Amino acid sequence: MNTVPFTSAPIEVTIGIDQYSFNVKENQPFHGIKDIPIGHVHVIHFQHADNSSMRYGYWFDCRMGNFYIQYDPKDGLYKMMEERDGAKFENIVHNFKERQMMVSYPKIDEDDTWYNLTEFVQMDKIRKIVRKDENQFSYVDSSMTTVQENELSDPAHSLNYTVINFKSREAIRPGHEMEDFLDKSYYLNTVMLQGIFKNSSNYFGELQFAFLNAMFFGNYGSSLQWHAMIELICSSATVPKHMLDKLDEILYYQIKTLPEQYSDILLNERVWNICLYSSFQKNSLHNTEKIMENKYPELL
């Protein structure tokens, strides 16, 4: 069980760790988060009490280094850093742990939610979507735009999701215009899966990461990417049986976790109605359709 120690909490802030969150008061003696499950990526995220503008946070994997959080009064945010001195890090954390100044990652033993939301998410792939190679962790916030959004303006601060565009030469084979537009299987299976992602795990990992950025930061381009990757599968007539079954599980846990009050902004009525009721895969997402109908029947 790993630990992300905190130098201090100089400003009042709501701190998130994965799907959990807690309020820290200005100058409260808070010194970090312990008992973080090894084996998963994680996200530690922030919303200042005085400016609920800019949710922001850091994707990390404790297997890749020792990370700590310290507030920067110049840039005005909680920053993640890597401490290379492993002895300095054990000493800082043991001191903090002995004085019980850390919150414990509050995982219920029965509860597979985080695993289920991050099953295919890999740190190495996050670091290719979020480019900042000198760090092992990845910063994301509410305002960062995607490469695709930029085409339609600072490239260093962009989310390099895989561009999906249903009315593009990449998606449409010359001579198969109607076929490829109405049945996107060649775009899904040859262009994206075989060509770009290489396998369905990487595709699902980017899908899951886009959802999590949409949910935790309200990042609009991430929500667009999540919906596009759903729609490309549902709009394909020929999808491996194992991908459909896995997609149903993936979406079920995403819909289950979504705050009830954010459905209005984070769920695209057109895509969901198309995917559940009109698409080729309208009958292949039983778990997702059941939770959607019982939780958000208005959207439908």
């Binding site: 009315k167 593009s168 030469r169 449409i172 010359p174 215009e177 109607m178 537009f181």
Partner: protein
């Protein structure tokens, strides 16, 4: 964006553009079968592709064989229309290719956009105008070449005849849409008006009769009366 009453003069500026109407691409007669079920029989159709500035009409005849063994023909018809318009554009020299294509029905937007991906600089636009181009098959010479076709064929016409020698494009389009609106509202009356005086004929190389300027004013007045009448006969006013 969409074409409407506000940007109407844009049709007659010097940027090449084409209207595309797909109404008459997929045409059927509905009939009873011996078992007393209903069935359709396709008849020849046509794409109505028109330069509103010059009058040049690219009438692509859609022969019934194109539907043989196909499913969901009304959907296919939009994609076939888009395939043929894209083929037409590619067939034209660069300096004749349109800068905009305006579709008369919004269901043509995605089919045409997808077929024209190779031409990102050609704008595909809808329109809020309710244009009467469905009535093209009420023009006898257009109907005749469509019905007589035994294979796919493209036929070229000027739908303004020689009117541009005497009137502007704006006025020529206004006359065309008035004639077509009349033909659509009451075809029989409309055609009676156009031919009632047998001394006025249709030249072999023309579609409409050879009216003088004064005779066109009388004709156009008779078409308006017809349209208003029918509007009354319809709603009772």
């Amino acid at each position: 964006g969409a074409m409407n009453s506000s940007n109407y003069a844009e049709l007659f500026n010097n940027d090449i553009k084409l209207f595309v109407d797909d109404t008459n691409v997929y045409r059927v007669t509905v009939h009873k079968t011996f078992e007393g079920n209903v069935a359709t029989k396709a008849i020849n159709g046509c794409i109505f592709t028109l330069n509103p500035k010059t009058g040049h009409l690219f009438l692509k005849i859609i022969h019934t064989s194109v539907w043989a063994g196909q499913k969901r023909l009304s959907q296919l018809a939009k994609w076939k229309t888009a395939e043929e318009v894209s083929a037409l554009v590619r067939s034209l020299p660069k300096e004749e290719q349109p800068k905009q294509i305006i579709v008369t029905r919004k269901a043509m937007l995605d089919p045409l956009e997808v077929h024209m991906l190779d031409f990102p600089n050609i704008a595909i636009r809808p329109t809020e105008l309710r244009l009467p181009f469905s009535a093209a098959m009420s023009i006898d010479k257009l109907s005749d070449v469509v019905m007589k076709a035994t294979e796919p064929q493209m036929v070229l016409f000027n739908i303004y005849d020689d009117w541009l020698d005497r009137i502007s494009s704006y006025t020529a389009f206004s006359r065309l849409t008035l004639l077509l609106r009349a033909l659509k509202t009451n075809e029989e009356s409309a055609k009676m008006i156009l031919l009632s005086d047998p001394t006025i004929t249709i030249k072999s190389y023309h579609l409409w009769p050879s009216f003088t300027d004064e005779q066109w004013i009388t004709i156009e007045s008779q078409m308006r009366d017809l349209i208003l009448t029918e509007y009354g006969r319809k709603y009772n006013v």
